Structure formats: structure tokens, C-alpha cells
Amino acid sequence: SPYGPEARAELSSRLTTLRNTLAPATNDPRYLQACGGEKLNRFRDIQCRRQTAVRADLNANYIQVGNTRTIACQYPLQSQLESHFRMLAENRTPVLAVLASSSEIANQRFGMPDYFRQSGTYGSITVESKMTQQVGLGDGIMADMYTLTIREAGQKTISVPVVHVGNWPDQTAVSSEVTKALASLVDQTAETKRNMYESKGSSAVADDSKLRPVIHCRAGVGRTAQLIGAMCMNDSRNSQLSVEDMVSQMRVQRNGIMVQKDEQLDVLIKLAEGQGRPLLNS
Numbered sequence: 001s002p003y004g005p006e007a008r009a010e011l012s013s014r015l016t017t018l019r020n021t022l023a024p025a026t027n028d029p030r031y032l033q034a035c036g037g038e039k040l041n042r043f044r045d046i047q048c049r050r051q052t053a054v055r056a057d058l059n060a061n062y063i064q065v066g067n068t069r070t071i072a073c074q075y076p077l078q079s080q081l082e083s084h085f086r087m088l089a090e091n092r093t094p095v096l097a098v099l100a101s102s103s104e105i106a107n108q109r110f111g112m113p114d115y116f117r118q119s120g121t122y123g124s125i126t127v128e129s130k131m132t133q134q135v136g137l138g139d140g141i142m143a144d145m146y147t148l149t150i151r152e153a154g155q156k157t158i159s160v161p162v163v164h165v166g167n168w169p170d171q172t173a174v175s176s177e178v179t180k181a182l183a184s185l186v187d188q189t190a191e192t193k194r195n196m197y198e199s200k201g202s203s204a205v206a207d208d209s210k211l212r213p214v215i216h217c218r219a220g221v222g223r224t225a226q227l228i229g230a231m232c233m234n235d236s237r238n239s240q241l242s243v244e245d246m247v248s249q250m251r252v253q254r255n256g257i258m259v260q261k262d263e264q265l266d267v268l269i270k271l272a273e274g275q276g277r278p279l280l281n282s
């Protein structure tokens, strides 16, 4: 079976070698380095590929899996919020998908600022948050939606749709069914926003650094990677892109932890199987 235990063990073997090889060394030229004493990486060993980095002071990466273009990042640190909002505005972000739980955000020990559910001022940027609809995704998993209106004197005002899944626990995989529902919601949300820009003649539509969905959880490697893999499978341009390719690309473009847990890989495998998509490269 191309999805049996032998295939899965070979997949794991290739991916584990890759993870181990991509582990960050001290002052690794492959990874973005903190430029002074301000902390860059939320987690010391979850680093940001330098060549695909979005901003010099964020742990955030441009990701292209097959043809699917996204930004994956860590939950921004308090000191990073103004730069994070500039990244969101500059990218004309068509959807921000936050997969960190409400309980994580509320726990002040974790230093996860509540930046999208409340209005705020961050240096010269002001942000207005408004709640919109709520969508059940299956298995009691809920998506709460918001818009963030990002204002700054002398910048164009940009509003960003947010899909917050507030009850996807750390270090778990929601089911393949929930994942597919979530991927559809995120893609549909992005498409509606992109369409609006297109309807106004917007130039962002010609630029590939822009109009990227931005996805983060806590570290931006587990729940984030599971969603991005699912989104890549929802994109018809990615026929024959293997699970091996998809995971390897996320790893070389962000870090070797992408798809952190076996159960998160298993959801990708199950989604691939449902499509007749290969696990391994021949």
C-alpha cells in the first residue's frame, strides 16, 4: 500500500533526517539572527529561515508549497507588535489565521499579547478590532472572526480579516475533517478579500510577496504547518505534489520543526490518501 506502514516509515525517515540537519547552530547562516539584545525568537530553538524572512525583526517566513504562497510566523512578542502590524498592512493581508487557543493567550506567563481581539496603539500604528461572524468547524472546534483596521499617519489604512480558532490545543491535530473545513474557511476568507482589492484595481494583485494568508499559532510550526499543508492540498495547481515535498518545502523555508507532531503529519497523510496524492517522491 502506498499509504501503509512501510510508506509511512520511509516518509518519517526522510523527514527526520531533514529535521535533524536543519537544527539551528549558534550563529547559523541559514537562520535570522537577533540584531541586538531584543529577543527575536519566542522559542530559542524555533528559528526563522533567513532567506525567506519577511522582516529583519520578526520570526516570520514566506512559504511556497508547490504553488501556494503563505506567510507562517510565531505569535508576535509584545516588542514586535508594531512591526507585525506593518507586515500585515504591507502584505494587504487577505486573511490572518490565528490557531493559538484562548487559554494560551489569556495565560500571561506565555507572553502572547491579545492583539487582535481588542483595539490598541502600537507606536505610531493604531488598530481597531471588530468581531464579525462565528463558524463551527466540527468536533466542537470554533472559528471566531474579526476585522483589524490598521491605521498609521501617512500610510494607507488596511483592514485585515481574522480567523481565530480559539480551541485547537497545543501539540494536537484536529481531525482531517476539521482541518479541511478550516482550510476552506481560510481560503474562502482570503479569496473574498483578494476579490475586493481586485475590484478596486489594486496593484498588490500583481506582487507575489503580497496578498499572502498569514498563519500563526504559538511557535508557528505545529498547528500552523498542519493548516498550511491542508491549504496546499485545497489548491488545484498542486496536482502530484507529494507529502514529502510539502513538508520538506515548509522545513527548508522556515525551520525543521514544521509539522511538529506525528499526529499532525498523520492528518496530512490522511488528506493525501483521500486525494490519491503520493506520500513519497520516486
Ligand SMILES: O=Cc1cccc([C@@H]2CC(=O)CS2(=O)=O)c1
Binding pocket: 043, 046, 169, 170, 171, 172, 217, 218, 219, 220, 221, 222, 223, 224, 260, 261
Ligand atoms: O518549543 C517549541 C514549541 C513550544 C510551544 C508550542 C509549540 C507548538 C506545537 C503545536 O502543536 C503548535 S505550535 O505552537 O507550533 C512548540
